[PDB]
Design a protein around this ligand. Structure first.
Ligand SMILES: OC[C@H]1O[C@H](O[C@H]2[C@H](O)[C@@H](O)[C@@H](O)O[C@@H]2CO)[C@H](O)[C@@H](O)[C@@H]1O
Length: 468
């Protein structure tokens, strides 16, 4: 009987520090916007230049923010370069050099009076975070017992939302979000990197990686027994040997081959679509602009409403954690897509009617908080770990590179295109997100298999069975 040992908890918690990194760096940038723009202005005039226009300031601000996404796009797509070469554990250890570097560029850019270092810092930390968003579910997916793969997979998203919450709190200007201390707000990302790097050598390599990739059955078997607290891992070892046998009969998997081979096309389209369902839900937009929408809905101090949204963000991630093995992935993902379709619709109605009818403002405030709760029930955590369950050992790294890249890329696209669309459509802009949510609800119901409690082998065989 398999058990959740302290060893297993340790290995997984240490992995999700990378999750916390993604969450922190993603969210930290919003609060000090004015402070950093003032920094950008003061830097330019401290050299031999006129004060920047609003246009140049915006453009330099936008760049500081967006280059992080560009880094994440490149990093997440590059994961395949690391995990087969160095293994899963060592890849995580290695890439913390990017985290310390990017963090020091950001922490020093003010005293160095360099807008360039700020941008470079964001790009490097973006690269690190992209590699992480791929590394962590792959490691967690490969060391969790099958019966708890989904629950442990949800610890990845939990670290992310705790990352975001902490960045919001630190961003308070009586904490680190001031004119003098914002370099530390940004450079804080250094500290978790150092902590994780210290603990990582004591975490095990993936036994799946050791047995299947590196053909070290007796080492793998010994990891498994300690990690799960049982001598009897015969079935798990045998499933891995089956996977080893199939990987030996197939060519090395490339990214392109995923779309060529029938058996891989179905799971990769599912994988990519589910990332879109995460990002084309409007979560970027909703979180970023929630403060402005709270304020126009009358919230006297809208920062605290936003931190309140971050807390809701965390609570319902934990709710999902406890339901995903009982409800299954399909159910949790559809409920969350459905609920969000309802809330985004309600945001449009509220905003349209707010100036004519009384409490529609409060309904607007509610719609946003309930949106975030439905987002974390399913579309938040599930897309990040489910790709790991849709493939066996051979295709997984290339598959996760592709799916993770599509997550970052579509997130980038939401950030890029939403202000234009909001400009033209106003309150109706949330009906665009509603449309995607409904489309992806239908896709999920019809196309996404239940993965709960199934071995990779079983899941892969069913895909091969359809392709015939
Ligand atoms: O502004 C904070 C942050 O919120 C959203 O972050 C998402 C993330 O993109 C998803 O992959 C998933 O992990 O859930 C997070 C929210 O808990 C925005 O998409 C992101 O751009 C934004 O910075």
């Amino acid at each position: 009987t398999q058990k959740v040992t302290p060893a297993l908890i340790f290995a997984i918690t240490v992995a999700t520090i990378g999750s916390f990194q993604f969450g922190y760096n993603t969210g930290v940038i919003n609060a000090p916007e004015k402070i950093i723009k003032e920094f950008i202005t003061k830097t330019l005039t401290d050299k031999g230049n006129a004060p920047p226009s609003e246009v140049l300031l915006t453009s330099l601000w936008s760049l500081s923010v967006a280059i992080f996404s560009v880094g994440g796009m490149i990093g997440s797509f590059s994961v395949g370069l690391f995990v087969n070469r160095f293994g899963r554990r060592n890849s995580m250890l290695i890439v913390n050099l990017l985290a310390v570097t990017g963090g020091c560029f950001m922490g020093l850019c003010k005293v160095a009076k360099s807008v360039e270092m700020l941008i470079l810092g964001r790009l490097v930390i973006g690269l690190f975070c992209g590699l992480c968003t791929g590394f962590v579910p792959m490691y967690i997916g490969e060391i969790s017992p099958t019966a708890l793969r989904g629950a442990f997979g949800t610890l990845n998203q939990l670290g992310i939302v705790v990352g975001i919450l902490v960045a919001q709190i630190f961003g308070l200007e009586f904490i680190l979000g001031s004119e003098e201390l914002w370099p530390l707000l940004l450079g804080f990302t250094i500290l978790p990197a150092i902590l994780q790097s210290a603990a990582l050598p004591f975490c095990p390599e993936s036994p799946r990686f050791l047995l299947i990739n590196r053909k070290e059955e007796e080492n793998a078997k010994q990891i498994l027994q300690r990690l799960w607290g049982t001598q009897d891992v015969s079935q798990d070892i045998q499933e891995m040997k089956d996977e080893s046998a199939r990987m030996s009969q197939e060519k090395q998997v490339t990214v392109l081959e995923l779309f060529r081979v029938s058996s891989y096309r179905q799971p990769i389209i599912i994988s990519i679509v589910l990332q879109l369902s995460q990002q084309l839900s409007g979560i970027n937009a909703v979180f970023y602009y929630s403060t402005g929408i709270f304020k126009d809905a009358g919230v006297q101090e809208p920062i605290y409403a936003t931190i309140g949204a971050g807390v809701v963000n965390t609570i319902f991630t934990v709710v999902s954690l406890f339901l995903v093995e009982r409800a299954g992935r399909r159910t949790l993902h559809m409920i969350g897509l459905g609920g969000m379709a309802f809330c985004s619709t309600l945001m449009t109605v509220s905003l349209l009617l707010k100036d004519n009818y009384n409490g529609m403002s409060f309904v607007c405030i509610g719609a946003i908080l309930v949106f975030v709760a439905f987002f974390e029930i399913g579309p938040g955590p599930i897309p990040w770990f489910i790709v790991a369950e849709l493939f066996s050992q051979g295709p997984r790294p290339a598959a996760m590179a592709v799916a993770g890249c599509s997550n970052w890329t579509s997130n980038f696209l939401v950030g890029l295109l939403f202000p234009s669309a909001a400009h033209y459509l106003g309150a109706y802009v949330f009906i665009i997100f509603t449309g995607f949510l409904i489309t992806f609800l239908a896709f999920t119901f019809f196309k996404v298999p239940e993965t709960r409690g199934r071995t990779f082998e079983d899941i892969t065989r069913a895909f091969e069975g359809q392709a015939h």
